[PDB]
Design a protein around this ligand. Structure first.
Ligand code: ADP
Ligand code: MG
Lengths: 589, 458, 49, 206
């Protein structure tokens, strides 16, 4: 059969009858306006469905149109620069088709429009008669100037090519590839439909070795992240969250970005949806907009609670489809604390047992089964590509306390934590990443890259970490007894720590010279500031005063280092100027 | 002896909700019986009958009910309870949570089929563990020494190096002719699986290591049968092939969190913090499967790692573990920020079988007395350190400055040893006697005057 | 007049800096983990209901 | 003779308790003394020594017979009892004989079935009331009466009974009352006119 009838609605939940061949967690369309809901129980012929939309005016006997699939995304061209909700309805098309400001509760508008034409070209290896496995790229759609949309096979099916398309412009409904198999020949277009709860298959997990060049100086040096890794940041009101989310989209080596705003707010999501279309990317030629490589999943809390719980799985499935092409995806879940409040309402409506602070029993397992979808892996398919997914999930704990069933379960799964602080924003220290509470566990896998490319960076930062760790025990005694009892060895390492927090860590994002500090500038700005430290370690073992008053101009040359603009200043000049500062310190001592 | 009748194959599903599938018209259903679902889209899933009532059978599936029809799915009743093909060739291979190989290998050739639930050993024919395992860690082999047949967890937290000291006690596991290590990983990451796999191949130990790794993305009802599989091969090696087995059940908090979701889906009666009322008996069915028996020369020792939530020893994961097992090993967060590599806070640590495994014939005479004084000098000096932070650094008795001289020389010299150093028990007791030299001879109350005259002047 | 007020001042500083550190380390860490026990025990009375 | 475990043994008349139970421990005999015919509870967490007080009371007390009931505890604890007891003797009439000749064990460990934790408590008190009626001074050590209470909770969870506080059944305090009340120094039935006693020392595991 194909139709069911309603037989009773008691709120969001509909106990639809006459549905015998219905599967569990399969999406249906309830009512005359076709409200979307999923089958959540199945008692014989009746199927108990909870509706995503608002049931109001749904009669007994309305048709329940079965689809036959779980909650799934449409993967194909027309996705870059598009804004979806958590269940992938196009917000930029709903506001254009209907000419209104509301979501009309019955829109089964397709996520990818079937009216635009895409310039398709085949892989030029595939002929009529070739055997093809799942994951093989059989075409490339030049979607933008930046992104080449490699049309791939679905991982499910397999067969032999009997009809390939000629090079030309097609819709997303035109048949492009046709595959003979044992029983029946299958034909399918450029769009593939993959369930969002199902992990994408892949050949082999690889270890993560290459770092993410985020652009900031404290994050690329002291607490480094790898592409293929999982991080976490505190999601407070204002510490630094707007510039960590936007410098990682402008100034990173990641090929595509997916930004998942997951039930955020009314005006805090309208701020994001109007600031990301007006960002600018500096590619090797001319300037470009960031929305040629960025997709957004936008959810306010007026939206359905199951379109807020499945926003994370929509975002990670778009991040995994662009991983399998060979790109290096970076995904930022804007809030995972507002996602776990969408689990508590889903489980609280099903009368599930609360585990801890109201959250359900499967909270720590659903967070682990999402963060373990991130990693640099070797993709499927005979073209022999590799991809990556990096996940930056922000956590907004109640009251800023790190003891919570979501926050303490995030810190046990993520490896990197960039601890943003409220107090460093009140002292105008930008970016406000704290160094004591932060950590990074990818350092042991990043030495093999650092010994082949920079080779004087690994012992450089461990000296910079023990200086600032020494400063916190020195800060309690400067008000206790004072600097009058402070040692000649300890008063110098306090004075280079103030040089560290002013020159290396503090980085103004609106100045045109420090918007993107590359790692050649980053290794230079610390190698001339740690070499200043240990030559000041033997200068007290031979006077603290005469090194501060006579080298005050050398104190200025380190305090105008961050100014050595690398956009308009060559790399080899900056290396040349940094070597000249190294000789001035070795000659003055 | 053997089943010869053909298998009934029902398409008579009549209810499914959560992870539970309810079949009807089942002819004589059996409790704890294994079924084999085949989905309408062709994939296979296993199950276990959890409650029968007349002609109905409430089976829970191991992979989740996502996609299970009410008309098209077909359920085949294997007429027996869950048995696994066990062999001597399950030693050097890796497996997933359910039963299957991962290292591109074939299936097990089944020397016999053992029930994974086991059957409890007769307490009259169970002998006491006596032979102390020298594991090369000074916080263990000094004050919390394990025996051969002892269950002893590693009480850890999130982020602390409990995986690293798990691989450290695998290499240095010997007596004061190697251990056949069985490793069960449940709810672990990808890097944690690769850290244990590439360490067992680094030291050449993967000729006698059977890895049972179940990742975090694997289904959460396969985490229930993962320690039952890794202990039914460990009983095959130890109680039939006469082998000395070291079982490590890492992340036991991921087992019991996967036990809470199944019981909350059945709407069972909750205990503390949502965990079921049978959490003590379900943990003890995999903890009490250890020790050695009188008729055999093999043994099985369990070191189950668990991470306590919020560094709390009163959570139901480490509290109910202390009642079943025989003492714990407590790594600490405060000793990890000071970059001591084994951060083993010895104060809430314990070894209940260390009294019978040390002594004159076992290690030497002074072992039972220096460990009682190293424990009391550590406990007083932490009370003194909690007093000088309130009173001051100068308003103390001059005897209270030796307890600050002890602790700063205790944590860096006794317990801190490095990731590849394996101190013997005679190395440890000569390091532990040095720290008691800074005290007078009549301030050591736990050591009598007899063995003070033979060891303290040195 | 400045010697007898000096040595009686640091006699009244040690009785105040101890009373401050008796509150920050003994009295407040006993209350803030008493209040942590009320919330975990009131969550269990809600699940039993 | 065959006797039901849930039926209290008939007896002539109950007597007040006068003689103390000397456990051998110094804080137990001096500060908080217990009589023979008295009921005693030992709560405490893991690592406190609930068993070591019970082993030191089954080896050196002034009780005639000893019945030790391991109700849902460790298997190696019941295996160390029958190791160091026959090598430990006592002297009553100029002769020495091992303390295993006055000890009977009821061992139902936590690996064993669940509902047999209840049957191991009622067996161990019925053997304790049998040697009461000969004129001996029985002392019964229930190793855990908190694993018996977790057996009642799990059976009541399958019967879908309404719980009391913390999931235990509403009849929890009535099963504990009908177990500790069976203790007491009491004048036995029969014509030779003897007197017996039962001391219940049940360790709770909160
Ligand atoms: N008198 C004692 N002297 C030294 N150690 C003791 C003494 N009494 C108890 N202990 C220690 O306390 C531990 C407690 O054993 P046990 O009673 O089994 O713990 P639990 O209370 O959980 O049952 C013993 O294994 C022993 O190491
Ligand atoms: Mg005990």
């Amino acid at each position: 059969s194909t139709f069911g009838y309603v037989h009773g609605v008691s709120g969001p939940v509909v106990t639809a009858c006459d549905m015998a061949g219905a599967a569990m967690y399969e999406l249906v369309r309830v009512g005359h306006s076709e409200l979307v809901g999923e089958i959540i129980r199945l008692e014989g012929d009746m199927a108990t469905i909870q509706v995503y939309e608002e049931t109001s005016g749904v009669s007994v006997g309305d048709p329940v149109l079965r689809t036959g699939k779980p909650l799934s995304v449409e993967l194909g061209p027309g996705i870059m620069g598009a804004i979806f909700d958590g269940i992938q309805r196009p917000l930029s098309d709903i506001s254009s088709q209907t000419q209104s400001i509301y979501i009309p509760r019955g829109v089964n508008v397709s996520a990818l429009s079937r009216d635009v034409k895409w310039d398709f070209t085949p892989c030029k290896n595939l002929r009529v008669g070739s055997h093809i496995t799942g994951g093989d790229i059989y075409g490339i759609v030049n979607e933008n100037s930046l992104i080449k949309h490699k049309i791939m096979l679905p991982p499910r099916n397999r067969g032999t090519v009997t009809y390939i398309a000629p090079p030309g412009n097609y819709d997303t409904s035109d048949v492009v590839l046709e595959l003979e198999f044992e029983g029946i020949k299958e034909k399918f277009s450029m769009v593939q439909v993959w369930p969002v709860r199902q992990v994408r298959p892949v050949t082999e997990k690889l270890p993560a070795n290459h770092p993410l060049l985020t652009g900031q100086r404290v994050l690329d040096a002291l607490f480094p992240c790898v592409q293929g890794g999982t991080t976490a940041i505190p999601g407070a009101f204002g510490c630094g969250k707007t510039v960590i989310s936007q410098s990682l989209s402008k100034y990173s080596n990641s090929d595509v970005i997916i930004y998942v705003g997951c039930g955020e707010r009314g005006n805090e999501m309208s701020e994001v949806l109007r600031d990301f279309p007006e960002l600018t990317m500096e590619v090797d030629g001319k300037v470009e907009s960031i929305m040629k490589r960025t997709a957004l999943v936008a959810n306010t809390s007026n939206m359905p609670v199951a379109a807020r719980e499945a926003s994370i799985y929509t975002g990670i499935t778009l991040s995994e489809y662009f991983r399998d092409m060979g790109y290096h995806v970076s995904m930022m879940a804007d809030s995972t604390s507002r996602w776990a409040e969408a689990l508590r309402e889903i489980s609280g409506r099903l009368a599930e047992m609360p585990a801890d602070s109201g959250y359900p029993a499967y909270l720590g397992a659903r967070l682990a089964s999402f963060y373990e979808r991130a990693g640099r892996v070797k993709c499927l398919g005979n073209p022999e590509r590799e991809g990556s997914v990096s996940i930056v999930g922000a956590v907004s704990p109640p009251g800023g306390d790190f003891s919570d069933p979501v926050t303490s379960a995030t810190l046990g799964i993520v490896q990197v934590f960039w601890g943003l602080d409220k107090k460093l924003a009140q002292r105008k220290h930008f970016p406000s990443v704290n160094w004591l509470i932060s950590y990074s566990k990818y350092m042991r896998a990043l030495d093999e890259y650092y010994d082949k490319h920079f080779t004087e960076f690994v012992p450089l930062r461990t000296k910079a970490k023990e200086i600032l760790q020494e400063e916190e025990d020195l800060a309690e005694i400067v008000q206790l007894v004072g600097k009058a009892s402070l040692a000649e060895t300890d008063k110098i390492t306090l004075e280079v720590a103030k040089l560290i927090k002013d020159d290396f860590l503090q980085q103004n994002g609106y100045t045109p010279y420090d918007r993107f500090c590359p790692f050649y500038k980053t290794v230079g700005m610390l190698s001339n500031m740690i070499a200043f430290y240990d030559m000041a370690r033997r200068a007290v073992e031979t006077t603290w005063s005469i090194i501060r008053e006579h080298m005050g101009e050398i104190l200025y040359k380190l305090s105008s280092m961050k100014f050595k603009d690398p956009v308009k200043d060559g790399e080899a000049k900056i290396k040349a100027d940094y070597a000249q500062l190294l000789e001035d310190m070795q000659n003055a001592f | 002896n053997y089943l010869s009748q053909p298998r009934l194959t029902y398409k008579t599903v009549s209810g499914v909700n959560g992870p539970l599938v309810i079949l009807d018209h089942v002819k004589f259903p059996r409790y704890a019986e294994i079924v084999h679902l085949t989905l309408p889209d062709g994939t296979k899933r296993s199950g276990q009958v959890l409650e029968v009532s007349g002609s109905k059978a409430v089976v829970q599936v191991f992979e989740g009910t996502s996609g299970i029809d009410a008309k098209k799915t077909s359920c085949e009743f294997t007429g027996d309870i869950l048995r696994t093909p066990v062999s001597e060739d399950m030693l050097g291979r890796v497996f997933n949570g359910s039963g299957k190989p991962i290292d591109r290998g074939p299936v097990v050739l089944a020397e016999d089929f053992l029930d994974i639930m086991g059957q409890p050993i007769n307490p009259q024919c169970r002998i006491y563990p006596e032979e102390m395992i020298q594991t090369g860690i000074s916080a263990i082999d000094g004050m919390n020494s394990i025996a051969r047949g002892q269950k002893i967890p590693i009480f850890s937290a999130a982020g602390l190096p409990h995986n690293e000291i798990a691989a450290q006690i695998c290499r240095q596991a010997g007596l004061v002719e190697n251990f056949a290590i069985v490793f069960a990983a449940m709810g672990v990451n990808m890097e944690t699986a690769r850290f244990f796999k590439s360490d067992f191949e680094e030291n050449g130990s993967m000729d006698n290591v059977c890895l049972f790794l179940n990742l975090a993305n694997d289904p959460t009802i396969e985490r229930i049968i993962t320690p039952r599989l890794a202990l039914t091969t460990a009983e095959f090696l130890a109680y039939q092939c006469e082998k000395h087995v070291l079982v490590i059940l890492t992340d036991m908090s991921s087992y019991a969190e996967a036990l809470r979701e199944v019981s909350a889906a059945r709407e069972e009666v909750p205990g503390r913090r949502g965990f079921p009322g049978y959490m003590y008996t379900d943990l003890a069915t995999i903890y009490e499967r250890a020790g050695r028996v009188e008729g055999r020369n093999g043994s099985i020792t369990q070191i189950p790692i668990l991470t306590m939530p919020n560094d709390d020893i009163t959570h139901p994961i480490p509290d109910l573990t202390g009642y079943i097992t025989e003492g714990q090993i407590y790594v600490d967060r405060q000793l990890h920020n000071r970059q001591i590599y084994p951060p083993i806070n010895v104060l809430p640590s314990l070894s209940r079988l260390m009294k019978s495994a040390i002594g004159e014939g076992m290690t030497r005479k002074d072992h039972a007395d220096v460990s009682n004084q190293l424990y009391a000098c550590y406990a007083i000096g932490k009370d003194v350190q909690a007093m000088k932070a309130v009173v001051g650094e100068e308003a103390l008795t001059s005897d209270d400055l030796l307890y600050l001289e002890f602790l700063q020389k205790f944590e860096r010299n006794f317990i801190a040893q490095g990731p590849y150093e394996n101190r013997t028990v005679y190395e440890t007791l000569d390091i532990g006697w040095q720290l008691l030299r800074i005290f007078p001879k009549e301030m050591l109350k736990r050591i009598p005057q007899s063995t003070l005259s033979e060891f303290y002047p040195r | 007049s400045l010697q007898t007020s000096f040595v009686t001042l640091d006699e009244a500083i040690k009785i105040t800096n101890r009373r401050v550190n008796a509150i920050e380390h003994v009295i407040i860490p006993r209350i803030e983990r008493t209040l942590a026990y009320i919330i975990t025990e009131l969550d269990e009375r809600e699940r039993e209901e």
